[PDB]
Amino acid sequence: NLASSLSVDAPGLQNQIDELSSFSDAPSPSVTRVLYTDKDVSARRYVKNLMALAGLTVREDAVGNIFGKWDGLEPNLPAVATGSHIDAIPYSGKYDGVVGVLGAIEAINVLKRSGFKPKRSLEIILFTSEEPTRFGISCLGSRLLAGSKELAEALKTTVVDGQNVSFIEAARSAGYAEDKDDDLSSVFLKKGSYFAFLELHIEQGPILEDEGLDIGVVTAIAAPASLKVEFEGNGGHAGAVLMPYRNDAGLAAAELALAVEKHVLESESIDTVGTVGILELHPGAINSIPSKSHLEIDTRDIDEARRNTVIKKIQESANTIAKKRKVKLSEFKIVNQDPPALSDKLVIKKMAEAATELNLSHKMMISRAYHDSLFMARISPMGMIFIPCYKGYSHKPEEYSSPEDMANGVKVLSLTLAKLSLD
Amino acid sequence: NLASSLSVDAPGLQNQIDELSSFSDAPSPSVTRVLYTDKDVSARRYVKNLMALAGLTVREDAVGNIFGKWDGLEPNLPAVATGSHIDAIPYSGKYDGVVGVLGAIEAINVLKRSGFKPKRSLEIILFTSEEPTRFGISCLGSRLLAGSKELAEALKTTVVDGQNVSFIEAARSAGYAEDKDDDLSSVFLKKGSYFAFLELHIEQGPILEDEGLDIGVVTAIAAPASLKVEFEGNGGHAGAVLMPYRNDAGLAAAELALAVEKHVLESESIDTVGTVGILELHPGAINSIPSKSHLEIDTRDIDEARRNTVIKKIQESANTIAKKRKVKLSEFKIVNQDPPALSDKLVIKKMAEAATELNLSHKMMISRAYHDSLFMARISPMGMIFIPCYKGYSHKPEEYSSPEDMANGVKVLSLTLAKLSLD
Ligand SMILES: [Mn+2]
Ligand SMILES: [Mn+2]
Ligand SMILES: [Mn+2]
Ligand SMILES: [Mn+2]
Known part of the structure; x- marks a missing residue:
């Protein structure tokens, strides 16, 4: 046959x-x-x-x-x-x-x-x-x-x-x-x-x-989604700007990346994933405090609602982190959010x-x-x-x-x- | 005159x-x-x-x-x-x-x-x-x-x-x-x-x-110092690798950057500074889990001993984070440590x-x-x-x-x- x-x-x-x-x-x-x-x-x-x-x-x-x-x-x-x-x-x-x-x-x-x-x-x-x-x-x-x-x-x-x-x-x-x-x-x-x-x-x-x-x-x-996030701070001289006066955009990004992981794990399902695959600092010099950070985040689940909860939490955390770090949440864009x-x-x-x-x-x-x-x-x-x-x-x-x-x-x-x- | x-x-x-x-x-x-x-x-x-x-x-x-x-x-x-x-x-x-x-x-x-x-x-x-x-x-x-x-x-x-x-x-x-x-x-x-x-x-x-x-x-x-640090993990597909099986080098880097800030603040002196001005992910794609991260860290103090204590703590944290994240601490280089x-x-x-x-x-x-x-x-x-x-x-x-x-x-x-x- x-x-x-x-x-x-x-x-x-x-x-x-x-x-x-x-x-x-x-x-x-x-x-x-x-x-x-x-x-x-x-x-x-x-x-x-x-x-x-x-x-x-x-x-x-x-x-x-x-x-x-x-x-x-x-x-x-x-x-x-x-x-x-x-x-x-x-x-x-x-x-x-x-x-x-x-x-x-x-x-x-x-x-x-x-x-x-x-x-x-x-x-x-x-x-x-x-x-x-x-x-x-x-x-x-x-x-x-x-x-x-x-x-x-x-x-x-x-x-x-x-x-x-x-x-x-x-x-x-x-x-x-x-x-x-x-x-x-x-x-x-x-x-x-x-x-x-x-x-x-x-x-x-x-x-x-x-x-x-x-x-x-x-x-x-x-069901896949992706997000872009940017934080902005004042930047300046890494050696001379004392710690209490900073608003470090890189640390805001670090905190958000860890928050992404946290909210994924909070779903209690092994089917939920989330990743920060892109994290870029500006100006990106060892002795320059980052004044802008840019993250791109991928998150997915077989269950659309469970995924959407992760996205909502990520936005909440981005805002909380921005206020705490005294930086501007200058971009929060959901690029796609598909069923x-x-x-x-x-x-x-x-x-x-x-x-x-x-x-x-x-x-x-x-x-x-x-x-x-x-x-x-x-x-x-x-x-x-x-x-x-x-x-x-x-x-x-x-x-x-x-x-x-x-x-x-x-x-x-x-x-x-x-x-x-x-x- | x-x-x-x-x-x-x-x-x-x-x-x-x-x-x-x-x-x-x-x-x-x-x-x-x-x-x-x-x-x-x-x-x-x-x-x-x-x-x-x-x-x-x-x-x-x-x-x-x-x-x-x-x-x-x-x-x-x-x-x-x-x-x-x-x-x-x-x-x-x-x-x-x-x-x-x-x-x-x-x-x-x-x-x-x-x-x-x-x-x-x-x-x-x-x-x-x-x-x-x-x-x-x-x-x-x-x-x-x-x-x-x-x-x-x-x-x-x-x-x-x-x-x-x-x-x-x-x-x-x-x-x-x-x-x-x-x-x-x-x-x-x-x-x-x-x-x-x-x-x-x-x-x-x-x-x-x-x-x-x-x-x-x-x-x-x-007294100025600078460090280069790299973490290595397995990387792979952001959508398909479930969270318990990851060893995300980007999250190791995020944790280390936050540890730098912590150890600086632990000095209890306003004269101590530390910064992560460079944090790079590889391969740097939204849907690829970072398999390598690269940090460059600047830290200084007018007091040399206090500065050195910060460096020692950063190295300790890099090792603790590497073990917890199950990544390799593939580079820890003190590029300079000057009086x-x-x-x-x-x-x-x-x-x-x-x-x-x-x-x-x-x-x-x-x-x-x-x-x-x-x-x-x-x-x-x-x-x-x-x-x-x-x-x-x-x-x-x-x-x-x-x-x-x-x-x-x-x-x-x-x-x-x-x-x-x-x-
Ligand atoms: Mn100069
Ligand atoms: Mn200069
Ligand atoms: Mn394909
Ligand atoms: Mn593919």
Whole structure:
């Protein structure tokens, strides 16, 4: 049957993972690859070439989401879509995102080798960017596909990066958003344009590995939020300004970072997380008392209300700390505060059937990380396939998924796409 | 007499202060000017031009200390020296250091207009750098003039900046070519090679302004130290690594910064200070748990033993925090731990006499900031002349000393140089 016929070029896929990792601003084994930079442009060209070699019809939208379609026997029907991202945060790994892009192309090649003939077309999406590194905006491509007018407006009017380069200027340097007449609504997909959307991804947790399982059938994605906070004080000379006269913006930031941890732990649930991954001091000189501090805070929970309580407490603490330290709370901005997504029950059923037919052990589980799937779920029924990764490591160069684990994920993706194409 | 004949071009000196401030990597009103950068080179050239216009013999040593001599009637006698620095930490003011360099040149011009005939030569020193910004080393020039073999060795073997540029490469780019035969010992001054060393400097405190006084006669300089600390943890995914499994290097850093403040306050003396002016996270992404943190800590006291107790407590806390957070204390480096210095009693005497002869009010006081004077004191009798500054502000663009305050300092410097030259 179809399932028994599926065969993946596992070393070939690994070779592509390694080749793509060369497009990096960080030295190997780390990867850094940021939206619209030269390394991103090179990586896009590499992927588009692989899509062409796979016989896919390739197109791009106004912000650089890339689509590669295998036309079905009934091409007017909403297609079955799959895909992921290839951007990488600073000093991260080679597998996050990339497995779901290169692996989706491999799933096409696998199905073609088996002589599968899709009824509904299959389409691979390379999302233009999923990581928030450049503009503070996660899932930039999929948020637009899912029809965010607010985001489209912001991208055209106010959005800039840390070097004051605008979104539009960055896009144009990479070959996109050239048309002046587009408010970016051209990117929006109407609800139902895809029959379903699937994303293959490394688990980014140790559960499948610890339990000895091959496949996670993802049932939900946890609710993510992020915040930016700034404090301002008077600054001055570190040697000469006596302690009673200070209002140290760095100490306010230190206290807020510890308050974030405290409020997360106060939830009493191990599913709650919060992190201060960015903490910058100005002027940032050893002998200058910080007059401005800038924090960026990530916080999430599978339970939206429980997460929101953490956010409320963080704002309360920022105000309490500012008053105590006698500094100005000059910025407190919630950058995003998004609900969780639920995978579609029929997609879940088909995925689990596919794993069973392939003799692959599996469990149903939640995603802690967010993904493009979070926003694609607003447009069509969604599911995700998790594969194991070594010790759950992710967002660091120790991240690793074996050729066998990737091949298993590709087989499940191939078979689930096939099932949905004939639905 | 000589005193009554001294006249300063006060607006002209102000104009020079303003012109020099244009050599900056920060937009006005702030100044940033770092050792061996293009802005530093431009400022060196500006000063050397003024020295030549004042008829001084101009020379430079291996690391770029600049000397401008007015030859006396007895040129073989140890000269009377004066000088300061022109480097500026990020986003600082226009007066720190610069007043004692431009003001020293103006003092020469003042004495020449009055027809003064020196016995001992007078020599102006532009120290190559006094701020620790680039290499973490304060008083780089004067520590070398004072004969630090440990520093000379480090500069040629291990010292690099934050961008991994070596001291040698940086010096070379600024026109200080490396002599592989020179271990920098060529820079060392013989003890007693100067009769005395004087530094004119803004107070960097509010005392003279608050008390309505013209001149501070500095009697001692507080004991400065600095520390570099790094913590290392596992890092990883901000969304997926659950709180009990973390070893967050950023939170270790936050706790250490708060411990620094605590230990300073524990001294029970208002003269004790400590600051964390630099706190950097790696990888520094919103969704990546910090795997490395880097702190640079400044701590000082007029009392050396009290200062040292603070340092010991900070090291104890760094170890306690590392154990509790389950991170590695990967670096704990005391970069410098220097004793205080006392001004020479006969230099103090001459300075007070000069202020009195000029009908300027004055008081004895200590310096909280460190200065090149701290290390020149190891080579020759030392003193400092403080002038008032607005609200004591320093290391920020609000720093200000009036044209009159500078001119009065210049007059005291001129007259003190003259008195010492004839002694
Ligand atoms: Mn990621
Ligand atoms: Mn991802
Ligand atoms: Mn300074
Ligand atoms: Mn200074």
